[PDB]
Amino acid sequence: NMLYHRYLKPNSEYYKKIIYELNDIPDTYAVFLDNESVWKHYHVKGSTLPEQGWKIHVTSSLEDSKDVLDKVARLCIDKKIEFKHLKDKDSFMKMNSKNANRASSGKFITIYPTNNEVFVELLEMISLAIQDFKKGPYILNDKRWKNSNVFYRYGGFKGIFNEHGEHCQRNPFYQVPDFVKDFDDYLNTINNSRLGKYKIETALSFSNAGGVYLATRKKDNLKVIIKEARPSAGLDGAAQDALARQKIEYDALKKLKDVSGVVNLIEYFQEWEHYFLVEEFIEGRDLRQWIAQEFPFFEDNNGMSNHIKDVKMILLQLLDLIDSMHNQGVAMGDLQPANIMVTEDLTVRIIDFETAMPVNSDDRPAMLTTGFVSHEMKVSGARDWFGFKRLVRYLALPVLTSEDLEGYLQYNHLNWIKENYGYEFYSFIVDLQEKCDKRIKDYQTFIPKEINLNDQTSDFNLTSIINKLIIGVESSLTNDERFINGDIRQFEMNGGKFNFLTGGSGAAFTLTKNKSSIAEVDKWIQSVLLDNLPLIEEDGLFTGKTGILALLYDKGYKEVVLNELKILKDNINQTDISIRSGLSGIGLFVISLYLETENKEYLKLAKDLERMIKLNRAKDKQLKVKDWMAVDIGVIDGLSGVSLFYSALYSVTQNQKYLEEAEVLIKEDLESTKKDDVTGVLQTVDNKNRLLPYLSGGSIGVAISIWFLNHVSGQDLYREEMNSILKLSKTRCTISGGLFDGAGSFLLIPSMVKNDKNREVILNEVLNLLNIFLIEKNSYYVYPGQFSYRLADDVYTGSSGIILALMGVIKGNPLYWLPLVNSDEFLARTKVK
Which residues bind Ca(2+) (predicted)? Predict the structure, then answer.
């Protein structure tokens, strides 16, 4: 999810992507680099090393980090010792940023002396060469010498990979082996309170920069936040350490001690070698959390006026607070929902000022929160106001957007606010907006956009939406190998450029269903794709070859598909049973091919795949998840998905066993659901205890599997659960718009509803949701990808997924997003009898 930032290349509506070598190496060394690892390996001579011994770590500050590798590595070659170091300055940053993992932070060079003797031998003569230098980050994993950047401790050298996941331990603190404890006592002997007035209960968070600690002042009982900043550790894009940031938080907290909204400074001192900022411990939630917990996501016809109250209250306080801050010449330089807190009585507080900057300064900040920023703002104070301006609309409609799409989605958003709230609240928002507009004009020449709401209208005609999204896709063909722009996964994942989920086949399949762009599709299939087939190892329905084979077969490439089918069993991944990428998805494809060709060899293969699924299930009951957005419940990556396979297999088999299995797999997924007490809506429960509606990981997925179970068998099982899931149609707003993870999921609800009067309401509800996202551009429609930061045309997040869902509604086909052979006939062919 944080990966998205890497794909916000300037001046594009699409997701597009934006060394420590030594001097004169002796031939006695083998050098291994890394397009994978952070480590640049140095193997010495020919002989390998002990599995575990005492190792030396060398840390280094930034100012001159090159002068510490130019020296230490050469004594690692004078004595001919084995070592490894970070690849590049870039890799240095990842290990030594605020963000970095403390466990192995600081570690720049790792030296491997064999054991005991050469270790102490080395550790001394290193410190003679690197003694006249700036100190680097202390490694909280190791022990230190004097004022030395030389560290040490015991651990494995070349970590084996075992059953429980060895790596032979590196922990946030210091440790001792129960084995070689004796030699530990040796070096012990060669090696040469202000916060005592606080009782530290617990720590909220730690980081590479330091901890944040809940403490009660010794005899006073006042709860305080204690913010640690250890020097030179936790670097910024700006190359500023934890300290420099802390002594900017300090300056600001005083300078606005008079503002009662701002957190109040208690004290600020030094200790061991660290620096501590003590502040007043505030109770409530950030606006992100407040929105998550308090926003009326479910549409009840008992009004939404309560929320209008609280928003108006919160925003006005915030308007005051920002004015106060700007009086004192300080801009809180990251104005966005994370940094605004709000107590149980809804008192607006600002808590972190590490990003504070003098208003009137035109310096690029270290950190920009996409969604609450614009490249138009060139001055610190104006950045605050723009933040607030966007935050204003956000509390009304909590749906992120980037500057690249804001030109479109402001229409959709503002129109939504009116249609759903009073005109009074619409006009409140739009006034407070323009109230911000020229608080900006104070700091900089800013000539704002003139918005007329009647220039964009929301669309509820399925044929119109499908037609216009198609015309969009046709107008948006890349002339390259991807065919369409899509999610970042086109670049991040194997086969992502070609597969059904994020690649060209998704669009080509969709365009084919709408009889559009035949020549463009034929060109892409012939010039690209067929040549890329041999390079896609994965067989997955969405992620790999099988979804592509569906496209290919429909388009007339029997010979290719039939040869692929011959190869399909022989080498088949068997650890994975999901619809996304495992045996269920493949099996579903294989059954569809059976139905189309009536070749009984495909039925046999389908039964072989089932046996593999049975085996996998027996082996262990833990599902394996490869995508970072994958969740082991529901239709895409869990057991509901596998039930799709059993149901389909049942249809071509008439064998009750498969039907009973289909049922059991749904039952199992239903155990991880939770019915809400107020609103009677059923959702799935994540492992992170998140509640999910979406097609990917959510209850809409489970409903689809119930529907298909019922479709093949002529039953009406799980009606109670079903009815509780269709109630999700009352959802207003979602984080994102896409079929898998966003609004598009909800389009699948109406396609499951038999009677029309009930359907038409549900359809209208879900089209209200779609219309937050559906972008009018030129004469046609396009669609925002994940987080509405850029447009996407793929199935996973973009317009192709929407089109398929919408055609699903028309056809009463909740399975229409699956890339199956034929598929216009699939329901008819799998129906009961």
Answer: 352
